[PDB]
Ligand code: HEM
Ligand code: NA
């Protein structure tokens with residue numbers, strides 16, 4: 001898990017809960033004097049432990065917290081990798097380019113990142129079938145991110161998530177409906 005993910009998480013926790021809470025989280029779930037260098041790899045268990053702690057503090061379902069983080073996370077990355085996201089002029093293009101453009105770039109920007117396997121298929125009625133697969137099973141982070149990407153393009157979406165690794169499958173299917181964006185008028 002790359003430091004950049006931890007950095008954006010810090011920004012989120014500091015904004016919602018305060019720096020005092022972030023320091024508690026860091027002292028408890030990370031070794032002494034931990035500093036997350038953005039480009040460096042760290043143990044994903046450090047992230048999961050922090051996020052699980054946050055969920056418990058807020059009395060929220062863990063996946064609802066991961067989804068919220070995902071939405072916050074898209075803006076964090078879009079602002080840290082503005083050149084990558086500016087390759088796309090709309091939400092649908094970006095989603096269709098997550099694997100072959102965005103995360104492909106991430107392999108050139110970062111040393112050996114740990115990334116999901118994603119494939120998007122355009123459907124009729126302005127829908128997208130996004131297939132997700134990863135041993136980390138962060139499909140709800142992916143949902144959040146998609147909602148973040150929608151917000152970035154002033155678009156509105158709904159997501160159905162009825163095939164899932166958490167209910168036994170070896171992948172998730174995220175069916176995205178684009179309800180509105182700047183190029184969508186009556187239908
Ligand atoms: C809707 C858009 C996106 C989706 C759905 C998505 C999906 C994901 C997910 C779910 C993960 C967690 C790892 C896993 O699941 O195995 C991940 C990792 C990552 N992605 Fe994204 N992503 C999106 C956009 C972006 C953008 C815009 C960037 C930066 C330009 C980016 C760069 C990264 C990085 C740096 C990691 C961490 C890799 C590591 O820790 O080794 N992604 N991606
Ligand atoms: Na519109």
Ligand SMILES: [Zn+2]
Nearest residue numbers: 139164165172
């Ligand atoms: Zn899932």
